[PDB]
Ligand binder design. Structure first.
Ligand SMILES: O=C(O)CCCC[C@@H]1SC[C@@H]2NC(=O)N[C@@H]21
Ligand SMILES: O=C(O)CCCC[C@@H]1SC[C@@H]2NC(=O)N[C@@H]21
Ligand SMILES: O=C(O)CCCC[C@@H]1SC[C@@H]2NC(=O)N[C@@H]21
Ligand SMILES: O=C(O)CCCC[C@@H]1SC[C@@H]2NC(=O)N[C@@H]21
Ligand SMILES: *[C@@H]1O[C@H](CO)[C@@H](O)[C@H](O)[C@H]1NC(C)=O
Ligand SMILES: *[C@@H]1O[C@H](CO)[C@@H](O)[C@H](O)[C@H]1NC(C)=O
Ligand SMILES: *[C@@H]1O[C@H](CO)[C@@H](O)[C@H](O)[C@H]1NC(C)=O
Ligand SMILES: *[C@@H]1O[C@H](CO)[C@@H](O)[C@H](O)[C@H]1NC(C)=O
Ligand SMILES: *[C@@H]1O[C@H](CO)[C@@H](O)[C@H](O)[C@H]1NC(C)=O
Ligand SMILES: *[C@@H]1O[C@H](CO)[C@@H](O)[C@H](O)[C@H]1NC(C)=O
Ligand SMILES: *[C@@H]1O[C@H](CO)[C@@H](O)[C@H](O)[C@H]1NC(C)=O
Ligand SMILES: *[C@@H]1O[C@H](CO)[C@@H](O)[C@H](O)[C@H]1NC(C)=O
Lengths: 120, 120, 120, 120
């Protein structure tokens, strides 16, 4: 089994902590990004998500509410286990910027990927 | 002020209901999709997300844990208000499928958009 | 049969003109975007793409080499025809910005959608 | 400088050849994917794209017309050079499937990433 609970780092150097996953697969956590539009502003930021509970290699999603900008990121992915019991989170994300009005909506969404492994 | 609490529909005919947004911008809800890989299986499914609280046109994200498949979707976007006080959510999404192992990860993520307006 | 040759506009007000499609499904064209990072710089820009030839509702892709910035956009989608012979292109796109070095790669890709209908 | 001309492999094991880039940045090539929806059907497939010509680390895009399915993929990205002169293509892609009619359009687009390095 592949619980999200724990500490994780990604390929950019970001650090994420996921707390207890409840019986509905819901979880809270924190996220310290290594990169940002204005990296001097970075602070620890909250996340909230849901994973599938029963699956051995569950899919999941979470939202990061950045505390230092008007942006939001969502991540979705799957937790995989090796033959050796090593876990990897393979994810993709959408990063939504705040724009002034609906005419700028077209430019407000960035896309990318991240792989996470456990810190311990 | 552009608020998420209430009932919404999107351009595909899906319905979502978001409950009270707390002081941290967190919300729960339910999502009834009009479409699926197997539309005969569709059931009402829970969501969990976060919005920015203070912005008049906030960005937000949420995760939908589909109750009828192993997939997960995340939505992110922004709530816009026009002259008349009419609200629209402009969103993009990632839909993560469950695959058997990490060698299939490349095909596991679909992307799309949705616009939502209030229902009743 | 759903063909790409001709003039089109999308939901943002951009105009594109596609020339003759050859026997391999290749086409050239021009693209006039209604929006940009710096809309004061916009100029008419070339495109190059490929469609499937034999399908009645073909999928296709094309690249737009913006003549006024260091960015590139790719569009992919499908041409649909309804009962009346009315054609619509449903597309998604990736807009790649130029960044200074590989450490900024994570922020370099925006995503979005466009629907196109014929002009004249 | 970072010409696309040459042979490249990606992180999935796919092989791509890009032929001469003309004075407008346009190029043809071939692509042998290591993976597919139906990998038993895979055959060598054509691509067509454009890169920026003058930039030392150009952005670019290309379209792959798959010869063995009704799908199309577009790739966009940037060519980066190391301090040692080693080139890497960092890309993202959209893979468009053919669907029967417009009501299924929502499910027709997959997204992902690939990094390429030179074969020689
Ligand atoms: O720049 C901002 O306003 C908020 C921080 C965004 C950080 C993004 S989220 C996707 C990518 N993966 C990370 O670990 N960090 C970046
Ligand atoms: O097919 C599944 O396994 C779960 C349902 C997926 C529904 C998607 S989520 C994105 C798009 N927007 C909708 O309202 N429904 C579809
Ligand atoms: O801003 C730039 O540097 C180049 C212009 C980008 C225009 C984008 S491409 C996607 C979207 N669809 C359009 O018709 N225009 C925008
Ligand atoms: O499955 C198909 O019908 C066509 C082949 C798709 C292969 C995709 S394109 C994106 C990804 N990167 C690759 O090198 N191959 C896959
Ligand atoms: C991400 O994956 C790459 C390629 O497998 C690997 O080299 C790297 O260690 C991974 N990063 C993390 C934090 O897991
Ligand atoms: C973020 O960075 C910008 C540019 O330095 C600064 O002016 C702004 O006040 C910062 N905002 C926050 C929330 O830290
Ligand atoms: C979505 O936007 C379209 C295009 O503007 C509009 O016609 C429609 O009313 C919107 N649909 C919903 C359900 O909000
Ligand atoms: C969904 O649909 C498939 C195909 O009809 C069916 O076999 C399966 O049992 C259904 N799964 C669930 C959990 O609803
Ligand atoms: C795009 O689709 C919308 C929503 O159906 C429609 O109202 C509009 O006519 C289309 N726009 C263009 C320019 O094709
Ligand atoms: C585009 O706009 C910027 C900002 O106004 C300007 O400085 C620059 O010269 C322009 N670039 C080109 C090549 O059009
Ligand atoms: C892709 O990048 C990863 C991480 O840097 C690297 O280990 C791998 O060798 C690269 N693959 C190719 C084909 O360049
Ligand atoms: C692709 O694979 C399927 C499933 O094996 C097969 O039935 C079909 O004929 C193949 N199509 C092509 C174009 O090779």
């Amino acid at each position: 089994k592949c619980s999200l609970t724990g500490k994780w780092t990604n390929n950019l150097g970001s650090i994420m902590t996921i707390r207890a996953v409840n019986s509905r697969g819901e979880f809270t956590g924190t996220y310290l990004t290594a990169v940002a539009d204005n990296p001097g502003n970075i602070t620890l930021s909250p996340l909230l998500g849901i994973q599938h509970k029963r699956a051995s290699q569950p899919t999941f999603g979470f939202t990061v509410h950045w505390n230092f900008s008007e942006s939001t990121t969502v991540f979705t992915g799957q937790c995989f286990i090796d033959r050796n019991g090593k876990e990897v989170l393979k994810t993709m994300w959408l990063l939504r910027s705040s724009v002034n009005d609906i005419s700028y909506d077209w430019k407000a969404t960035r896309v990318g990927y991240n792989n996470f492994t456990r810190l311990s």
